[PDB]
Design an enzyme around this catalytic site. Structure first.
Site, mmCIF file in Angstrom:
data_model
loop_
_atom_site.group_PDB
_atom_site.id
_atom_site.type_symbol
_atom_site.label_atom_id
_atom_site.label_comp_id
_atom_site.label_asym_id
_atom_site.label_seq_id
_atom_site.Cartn_x
_atom_site.Cartn_y
_atom_site.Cartn_z
ATOM 1 N N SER D 22 -17.468 -2.074 -1.936
ATOM 2 C CA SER D 22 -17.325 -3.312 -3.135
ATOM 3 C C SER D 22 -15.733 -3.752 -1.139
ATOM 4 C CB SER D 22 -16.739 -3.762 -4.056
ATOM 5 O OG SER D 22 -16.899 -5.699 -4.113
ATOM 6 N N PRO D 23 -16.235 -5.446 -1.146
ATOM 7 C CA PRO D 23 -15.239 -6.206 0.065
ATOM 8 C C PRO D 23 -13.423 -5.802 -0.965
ATOM 9 C CG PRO D 23 -16.743 -7.220 -0.213
ATOM 10 C CD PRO D 23 -17.017 -6.582 -1.028
ATOM 11 N N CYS D 25 -9.511 -6.395 0.581
ATOM 12 C CA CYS D 25 -8.623 -6.439 1.297
ATOM 13 C C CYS D 25 -6.782 -4.774 1.184
ATOM 14 C CB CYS D 25 -7.703 -7.635 0.847
ATOM 15 S SG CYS D 25 -9.060 -9.514 1.055
ATOM 16 N N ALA D 58 -11.954 -9.016 3.021
ATOM 17 C CA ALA D 58 -12.781 -10.582 3.399
ATOM 18 C C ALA D 58 -11.784 -11.064 4.526
ATOM 19 C CB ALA D 58 -12.376 -10.671 2.063
ATOM 20 N N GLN D 100 -17.056 -9.023 5.655
ATOM 21 C CA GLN D 100 -17.267 -10.694 4.521
ATOM 22 C C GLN D 100 -16.400 -11.214 5.551
ATOM 23 O OE1 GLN D 100 -14.547 -10.937 0.622
ATOM 24 N NE2 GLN D 100 -15.940 -10.691 -0.500
ATOM 25 N N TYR D 177 -12.135 -18.843 -4.054
ATOM 26 C CA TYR D 177 -11.688 -19.507 -2.707
ATOM 27 C C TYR D 177 -12.613 -20.288 -2.154
ATOM 28 C CZ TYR D 177 -9.003 -15.056 -3.143
ATOM 29 O OH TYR D 177 -7.796 -14.378 -2.662
ATOM 30 N N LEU D 296 -15.338 -2.662 -12.449
ATOM 31 C CA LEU D 296 -15.741 -1.150 -13.220
ATOM 32 C C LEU D 296 -17.126 -0.288 -13.488
ATOM 33 C CD1 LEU D 296 -13.910 -3.449 -16.071
ATOM 34 C CD2 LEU D 296 -12.463 -1.470 -14.341
ATOM 35 N N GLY D 318 -15.433 -0.924 -5.507
ATOM 36 C CA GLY D 318 -14.409 -1.278 -5.839
ATOM 37 C C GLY D 318 -13.687 -0.232 -5.987
ATOM 38 N N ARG D 319 -12.543 -0.540 -7.372
ATOM 39 C CA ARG D 319 -11.653 0.303 -7.228
ATOM 40 C C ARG D 319 -11.470 1.833 -7.147
ATOM 41 N NH1 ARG D 319 -9.565 -4.112 -12.171
ATOM 42 N NH2 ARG D 319 -11.704 -4.163 -12.167
HETATM 43 C C1 LIG Z 1 -6.576 -5.111 -3.695
HETATM 44 C C2 LIG Z 1 -8.148 -5.343 -4.596
HETATM 45 C C3 LIG Z 1 -8.499 -6.220 -3.372
HETATM 46 C C4 LIG Z 1 -9.693 -7.221 -3.579
HETATM 47 N N1 LIG Z 1 -10.051 -7.890 -1.837
HETATM 48 C C5 LIG Z 1 -11.827 -8.839 -2.318
HETATM 49 C C6 LIG Z 1 -12.296 -9.440 -1.494
HETATM 50 O O1 LIG Z 1 -11.807 -8.921 -0.566
HETATM 51 N N2 LIG Z 1 -13.585 -10.418 -0.949
HETATM 52 C C7 LIG Z 1 -14.030 -9.972 -3.118
HETATM 53 O O2 LIG Z 1 -14.938 -10.906 -3.402
HETATM 54 N N3 LIG Z 1 -13.543 -9.386 -3.825
HETATM 55 C C8 LIG Z 1 -12.433 -8.241 -3.521
HETATM 56 N N4 LIG Z 1 -11.726 -7.635 -4.748
HETATM 57 C C9 LIG Z 1 -12.742 -6.857 -5.615
HETATM 58 C C10 LIG Z 1 -13.773 -5.846 -5.772
HETATM 59 O O3 LIG Z 1 -14.123 -5.537 -5.182
HETATM 60 C C11 LIG Z 1 -14.967 -5.689 -6.825
HETATM 61 O O4 LIG Z 1 -14.874 -6.915 -6.959
HETATM 62 C C12 LIG Z 1 -13.810 -6.277 -8.265
HETATM 63 O O5 LIG Z 1 -12.855 -4.869 -7.867
HETATM 64 C C13 LIG Z 1 -14.452 -4.853 -9.238
HETATM 65 O O6 LIG Z 1 -14.925 -3.401 -9.170
HETATM 66 P P1 LIG Z 1 -14.027 -2.329 -9.450
HETATM 67 O O7 LIG Z 1 -13.648 -2.958 -10.429
HETATM 68 O O8 LIG Z 1 -14.928 -1.210 -9.891
HETATM 69 O O9 LIG Z 1 -12.829 -3.089 -8.477
HETATM 70 C C14 LIG Z 1 -10.648 -6.405 -4.723
HETATM 71 C C15 LIG Z 1 -10.344 -5.692 -6.310
HETATM 72 C C16 LIG Z 1 -8.946 -4.995 -5.693
HETATM 73 C C17 LIG Z 1 -8.506 -4.507 -6.394
#
Ligand SMILES: Cc1cc2nc3c(=O)[nH]c(=O)nc-3n(C[C@H](O)[C@H](O)[C@H](O)COP(=O)(O)O)c2cc1C
Ligand SMILES: Cc1cc2nc3c(=O)[nH]c(=O)nc-3n(C[C@H](O)[C@H](O)[C@H](O)COP(=O)(O)O)c2cc1C
Ligand SMILES: Cc1cc2nc3c(=O)[nH]c(=O)nc-3n(C[C@H](O)[C@H](O)[C@H](O)COP(=O)(O)O)c2cc1C
Ligand SMILES: Cc1cc2nc3c(=O)[nH]c(=O)nc-3n(C[C@H](O)[C@H](O)[C@H](O)COP(=O)(O)O)c2cc1C
Ligand SMILES: NC(=O)C1=CN(CCc2ccc(O)cc2)C=CC1
Ligand SMILES: NC(=O)C1=CN(CCc2ccc(O)cc2)C=CC1
Ligand SMILES: [Cl-]
Ligand code: NA
Lengths: 351, 349, 349, 349
Positions: D22-23, D25, D58, D100, D177, D296, D318-319
């Site tokens: 997942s994207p 930043c 992003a 992204q 956004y 999650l 993501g995380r």
């Molecule tokens: C530091 C951090 C930066 C993130 N940056 C973006 C982003 O730039 N664009 C986006 O669509 N989601 C962004 N997310 C959200 C994650 O991509 C993801 O949708 C969200 O963390 C849920 O997935 P996860 O809990 O498995 O990590 C970010 C999340 C975190 C913790």
């Protein structure tokens, strides 16, 4: 190395040759003054027959004593040639190769010394189409009369049956190199005024008559070869396209194969010498006329012989000077193409 | 007098002789397809070997058109620097630089020969959905839009080679790769307007040939390598090639390079010295298009002989230059020709 | 079984075979003697050609010890970059990189062979003030203080050559160059302790040989190229070499490369295949020093025969590798031995 | 056979598995928005971790469209070198590189999360003049010339992203956004044709999707990230998403990435494993557009289950990949599937 056409049998007339390699006719000038085969030929040719060529065409043998190139050419004009010629064919066949022979008449080029004894005219009463010397030093040729020409035609006919009687199963008629029948074809030596000169058809006449007469006495099974100078190389002369007309008519009389040479009609001429430089003549005849052809001319390699056969440029590859320096070349050419050569048992440990 | 070392006039150029190096993959490119140090020693060496022309290996016009991950590439303009430097120091040695544009089709995505040579499972493309063999990905049948997209890769890929100094462009339409796959019915049993008939099987290949020809100036010859036969019965025959050449000749292609095989593995080939020369001979004489002979051409005498016989205009050498890079130089002195040796090596000849 | 391609153990290294590239000047260095692109294609080509060892051309240890203005040099530390890349570029191709340290003596300062090859009038040095021949500068006899500079120049060159990765160093004391001229009395009529007797005329050369062996670790073999004969009357005899070699073997020299001639021009030489082999043969058996054969060794069978006959341990190839860089690769398979070829070329073998 | 590690065909591509990053930043770019050394290790590591696809963080299409001054950028062509090197080092590691494209709208111009995260007072833009929250600059409503300014900034950003080798581009229209703000009525109370009605709120966003779709070839899939629900009362709900999704489906958009929240802060979110999966499930089944599940998803068994249930086509992580970059490789072995691991790591699996 999955294949090799050069050592695939070639079927001509009614026999099969162990491969597509043949020995080009090459005078040794070692005959007697009456033209009998000598001990030299009985070692020269039988050696190269063991050398693996499917066919050995022994040198040009004159059908008339004064139709000889040199005084020591082989002869087939007397029935006393059979003993020597009969054994020659026997010792060639025993060695493995089919024995064939070239019948020839040297025409206005007749009566030359040996190449290593000078090669200077000797002063014979040579014959020819028109009275034009081959070059300075040569006797002025005598225009041949039909009576004469019938004698030569019948000299080639009786000469052929005499060759068959000796066991030779392939006969080649020398119509190249500026010798008698070649002289009739190229306009550089025949400016005759009769029905054997002028037109292209008239100039191919006598030659085509000799071909017809020999075809009648040679059974179908034995192929009749004809060696021709596909070009004189001098302009206003025998061209490549003229040969395809001549080749068309020989194929149509029943001639089985062509041997494509060049040159010899005249000296003041340039030949484009190179490996396989006469192959284009064999290729053109085989594909544009449909007559089987033999390639000759600085063919020295197994791969080169095999490639022109692959390319459909010829059915048989004739070897000349390569077999003088290398009599057993064909045996090593086979092993150089991944083919086990059928070698004599005494030499099997040498391969 | 040897024809093998007489200048040959093709398009608007003259080659110092009639010997060329056939394109041969080194599988030594980068993962992005950039020229490496290997090519900068490989190709310049054989050019010093005296070939009038160096045809560089199959260079993919698309990442998914590569044979191996280490094929050369021409799909990005960031390929130009490495390719220009290769073509530059090919000229250094004396030989004209040429390049082969290719798309591996259903044979795309294989390992290197010494790494297994086995498919890697890319989303390869092709005429019909038939794997090349067991283990290979089933190709995705191309749509009209899909193949036109390929063609613009061949066109811009050609445009890119010219920018780099390559003076000869050959379109790889042989050996069962993309455009070869469209020609042979053993791998193209398509039901639409791009299969069945020869013309249908020839459309897309000729569409690419025409499209590239338009961006290549007349002066620079456009070559085409074709598998003159599938070797499998009921497949691409020599006579199908004879129509393809007539139609390529009419599009402006300056020369045809006749190879064979590759479309499928379950087939026997009459393998022998100059066994593909009959294809060059047939095309050269029956259509009138210049042709290049290749296939176990290993001796000076045979190369000159097929040229003398009019079987071809150009002699392409492959595996001989792997074992003998300087063969053309030694072949010349073996033919009475003054070799064209470098001053530092003349004391060796 | 071919021993020609059996490993050879010299000092502390192993060579893939018993084939070596003889030193061969390309006269393509810069005016300061730096490695150029030519060397980086020339030698790397022949290293891929399969020689176990590449002896690069004579590189002068002094600017005026050069044969030509465009000889390689090892007198400045700015040679390392180019020289290091040469050894790197040689080792990658498969061959061990070695270098010949030389001083052209009274033959120094000649034009290129293809530029005339006639003297340029340098202040060349030598044992005695005798011109190599008419037209050439007469060398200025060197003093003991003068000679020490050269001795330290050769030690310097070896120490510098090791830094660059060259694992074999050969000292050029043949062909009438500085140290060869000291050996043959046709050019050494000195009146001091470095002329007259064989021992005095062998002194300065052995001092250089001793001094270099000291800087070169045991593991790396030290070669010495010698003109085994001068072909000139009242000159270096065959048996003189056996005394000189007996001394070099004592000094630590691991191998002798026996050539001949060069001291003077107006002399007879029996040109023939392996005509200098008898000199290599005599040294190995009568002294016990390893020997290297050179001199018109051009065929696989001939190299193996002289090694089989015990005339030498290493066969050095000269003009054959100019016309056939990959000759060793084809020689092995021409002797029933599978040659270790680059994977990119395995389908060419 | 686990579906999570079956090739995924989306567009003209085939991904080694159904796992994508997942994207996220890193806020580690330069002040001009160029890729730094951090990114050139961050993403390539996780690509080696075995994810079939890497969606880069992003990336702002406008300097004032950035979240932080150290966001990645694609507005100047001097980002391309850094972006190209990123896209290749991702491709070399095994994963397809995607990016992204984003515009932070009224949330633009914040500090880094670990430096305070407080707004910096940029002239941020948005649909209506409502601050994201107390302390944030009040966004200036955009005009059609203004909205076209961004739409074409999004278009060239895509054309620029393709140019760099990125084979998947996602348009960030979620998390409050710029384009998400136009969608949710809690942040868009515009009186013109770009506020009020769903269509109106969907108008400008769908215009960007269409504009980008036109410049992106079919072969490369166009992803779109959407806040499937704002979670705020009377706001963008799931069924607003299904209307939005159906119309993107027809623009040619290949897949939807379903997130939630971000439009406003003062709201409670049902935090739980796969709490946003129901939106991916609903879109895939009720509209027919492929979907990506995120939120999650931390275990191999859970990802395979939602794929089996047809809740999504692609599982985005993501995380989990921040704390466990090689999670996918071990997830394959945790499902009885042999993971294609780098050869250097094969003995560790
Ligand atoms: C530091 C951090 C930066 C993130 N940056 C973006 C982003 O730039 N664009 C986006 O669509 N989601 C962004 N997310 C959200 C994650 O991509 C993801 O949708 C969200 O963390 C849920 O997935 P996860 O809990 O498995 O990590 C970010 C999340 C975190 C913790
Ligand atoms: C001594 C010698 C004698 C020859 N005798 C004849 C001959 O009698 N009849 C003929 O047609 N060709 C003859 N030729 C020509 C060769 O048969 C052959 O056509 C020519 O040598 C070209 O082929 P090659 O280079 O392989 O020898 C002779 C050639 C040589 C060197
Ligand atoms: C390692 C190797 C790589 C080759 N790569 C190509 C290629 O990339 N494109 C092509 O059209 N032919 C390729 N070929 C085929 C040669 O170009 C040539 O057509 C074939 O090898 C027969 O030529 P030859 O027997 O003279 O070497 C390759 C052949 C070999 C051994
Ligand atoms: C162009 C050329 C350059 C040579 N340069 C050297 C040299 O620099 N140092 C040296 O000791 N011998 C040199 N030699 C002599 C060769 O090393 C070798 O002794 C000679 O070529 C005999 O071996 P070959 O017949 O295999 O070439 C050179 C020979 C040639 C043709
Ligand atoms: N001695 C010969 O070569 C002759 C030349 N052509 C044919 C016959 C003899
Ligand atoms: N490596 C090769 O030989 C290949 C076979 N056909 C064409 C390309 C490569
Ligand atoms: Cl009559
Ligand atoms: Na008469």
């Amino acid at each position: 190395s999955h294949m090799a056409l050069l050592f695939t049998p070639l079927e001509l007339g009614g026999l099969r040759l162990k491969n597509r390699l043949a020995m080009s006719p090459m005078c040794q000038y070692s005959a007697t003054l009456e033209g009998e085969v000598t001990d030299w030929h009985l070692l020269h040719y039988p050696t190269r027959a063991l050398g693996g060529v499917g066919l050995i065409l022994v040198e040009a043998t004159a059908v008339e004593p004064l139709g000889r190139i040199s005084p020591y050419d082989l002869g087939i004009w007397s029935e006393d040639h059979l003993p020597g010629l009969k054994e020659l064919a026997r010792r060639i066949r025993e060695a493995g190769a089919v024995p064939g022979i070239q019948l020839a008449h040297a025409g206005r080029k007749a009566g030359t010394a040996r190449p290593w004894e000078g090669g200077k005219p000797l002063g014979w009463r040579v014959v020819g189409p028109s009275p034009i010397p081959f070059d300075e030093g040569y006797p002025v040729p005598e225009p041949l009369d039909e009576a004469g020409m019938e004698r030569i035609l019948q000299a080639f006919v009786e000469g052929a049956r005499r060759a068959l009687r000796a066991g030779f199963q392939v006969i080649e008629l020398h119509m190249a190199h500026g010798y008698l029948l070649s002289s009739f074809l190229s306009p550089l030596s025949n400016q005759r005024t009769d029905a054997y000169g002028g037109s292209l058809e008239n100039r191919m006449r006598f030659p085509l008559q000799v071909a017809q007469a020999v075809r009648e006495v040679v059974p179908r099974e034995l192929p009749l070869f004809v060696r021709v100078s596909a070009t004189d190389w001098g302009e206003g002369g025998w061209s490549l396209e003229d040969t395809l007309a001549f080749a068309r008519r020989l194929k149509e009389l029943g001639v089985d194969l062509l041997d494509c040479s060049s040159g010899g009609v005249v000296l003041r001429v340039r030949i484009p010498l190179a490996p396989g430089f006469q192959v284009p003549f064999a290729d053109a005849v085989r594909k544009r006329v449909g007559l089987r052809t033999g390639a000759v001319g600085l063919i020295t390699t197994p791969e080169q012989a095999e490639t022109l056969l692959q390319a459909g440029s010829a059915d048989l590859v004739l070897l000349g000077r390569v077999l003088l320096r290398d009599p057993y070349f064909p045996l090593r050419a086979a092993k150089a193409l991944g083919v086990a050569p059928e070698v004599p048992p005494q030499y099997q440990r040498g391969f």
